[PDB]
Amino acid sequence: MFAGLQDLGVANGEDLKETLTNCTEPLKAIEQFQTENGVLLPSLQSALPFLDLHGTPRLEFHQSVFDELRDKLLERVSAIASEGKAEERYKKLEDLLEKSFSLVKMPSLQPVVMCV
């Protein structure tokens, strides 16, 4: 379902499959592959245990971050529609569409492209 992440150089599900097929010990491949693919926040590494100590999956954590940032992107694109000089804001919108249209079909990042 990663139609468009191939343009950004993002490793996709096919890459996960081929790494799992050409894997020797699962810990190495899975850990390295999804930790380089994970959110590179320096302080995030300490937050991971505390989320799952109660058994609450970290998927809820990542989805909460996703939803909050989706609210933020909607607000910011509305601000772009409102603030900024006509020429600079139009050029920004054009460039941002050019570099964000790769994920237009995805309902996850659909509001980005749709508002732009």
Binding site: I30, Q45, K92, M106
Partner: protein, 267 residues
Amino acid sequence: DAEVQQECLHKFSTRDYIMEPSIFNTLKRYFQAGGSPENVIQLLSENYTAVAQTVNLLAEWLIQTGVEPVQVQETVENHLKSLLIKHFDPRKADSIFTEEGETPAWLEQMIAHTTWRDLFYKLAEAHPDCLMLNFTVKLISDAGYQGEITSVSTACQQLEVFSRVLRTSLATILDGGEENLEKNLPEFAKMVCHGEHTYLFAQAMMSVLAQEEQGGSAVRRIAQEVQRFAQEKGHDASQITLALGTAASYPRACQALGAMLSKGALN
């Protein structure tokens, strides 16, 4: 090994389970099952929704607008702090610290940040019996950021903390001057007169310095202002002041002065 495969597929079937750092072990158990990884591959290609890519996109997009990244960074950190304060389990945190065998680096990563430091302080407040929380507080003290632990008027009941904060406030007053007389002096007085023990230490130290006149008139002035503020609050601090001075060497006159100053009238 069919049930292990079923458990792995149940765990993976939830969307966004790929970002789980735990998945390793679970998926490793799947490699222990010896089954075809086609189900796992298809499910994982169906669960990921580009959360990390969303965060990177959001960062670049917010930088483009013109709003500084400080606001979004602090908003994200506040959300993370809410999540950590709400979903903190002492038992598994202690178990991880015991099983790892060594002090983690990630604890040191959140030691060197103010927001995470306040997170740790509020956790230790909420979870006093959490031993790894106490270890984290110890490491924060080790790192040299002991100022951020409760101080000023909040935690002036401790010996070293009160003495240090009183010394700093006295230095602040003396760096203040005549212009700062109206502003900082009540701020100092409300934290030195919070108790009779802190006030006793303050007045004893004022009397000790007052034996020296090389600018000690400033310390005497500060002590007199503290005395009058304490009287405004309701202290019977005149007996304290007589305990400070040489006047107590004449018990009759000292007792008479205490009488007039507790009464407040010229008998």
